[PDB]
């Protein structure tokens, strides 16, 4: 009931970005970020780091340490 | 010249585990762990968290944050 996708959404909301704002800044298609936030797709570790970087959180936070 | 593979290797050696001891604790193939340490294959985020747990390190560390 808690997931990486849910923390990615929440962290993006904390940073102020809309989905398309975040995707375009990360040069990822909008559907891909949507798929990640919904836990439909597991991000590769490079992307995981880029998103931690854009939202100003630790990847440890997103993963549920 | 530095990579996730290289930090997983170092972090595992710091924890004291051999490659197969670590593979067996996490029930992943010895070849699979070797492929990760060698940067031949990207760990899925689940495996990345388990290994960070087994070595007592941050996923941020392994990722180069």
Residue numbers in the entry:
A (entry chain B), B (entry chain A): 0 to 64
The authors write:
ICEBs1 is regulated by the ImmR/ImmA tandem, which are a transcriptional repressor that constitutively blocks transcription and a metallopeptidase that acts as anti-repressor and inactivates ImmR by proteolytic cleavage. Regulation of ICEBs1 is exerted by the Int integrase, the ImmR transcriptional repressor, and the ImmA anti-repressor metallopeptidase, which are counter-transcribed from the PimmR promoter of the transposon. In contrast, if the global DNA damage response is launched or if potential recipient cells lacking the transposon are nearby, ImmA inactivates ImmR by proteolytic cleavage, which unleashes ICEBs1 expression and promotes transposon transfer. We here report the production and purification of 127-residue ImmR from ICEBs1 and the crystal structure of its DNA-binding domain.
After successive rounds of model building and refinement, the final model comprised residues M1–K64 of molecules A and B, plus respective N-terminal alanines (A0) from the purification tag, and 167 solvent molecules. Remarkably, the final Fourier map did not show relevant density beyond K64 of either protomer, which would be compatible with the full-length molecule set up for crystallisation being proteolytically processed after this lysine by a trypsin-like contaminant. The protein is a compact almost spherical pentahelical bundle (α1–α5) cohered by a central hydrophobic core, in which the N- and the C-terminal helices are nearly antiparallel, so that the chain termini are adjacent. Helices α2–α4 form a flap that folds back onto the two terminal helices. Following the nomenclature of HTHGBB-DBDs26, helices α2 and α3 would correspond to the “positioning helix” and the “recognition helix” of the HTH-motif engaged in double-stranded DNA recognition. The two protomers in the asymmetric unit (a.u.) are related by a dyad, which gives rise to an interface of 573 Å2 (ΔiG = − 2.1 kcal/mol; ΔiG P-value = 0.42427). The main participating residues are L3, D41, T44, L47, L48, S51, N52, T58, D59, L62, and K64, which are provided by helices α4 and α5 plus the linker preceding α4. Finally, the experimental structure is in very good agreement with the predicted dimer. Accordingly, the DNA major groove would be contacted through the recognition helices, and flanking helices α3 and α4 would play a supportive role. Putative residues engaged in binding would encompass T17–E20, N29–N31, S33–Y35, R37, and Y39–D43 of either protomer.
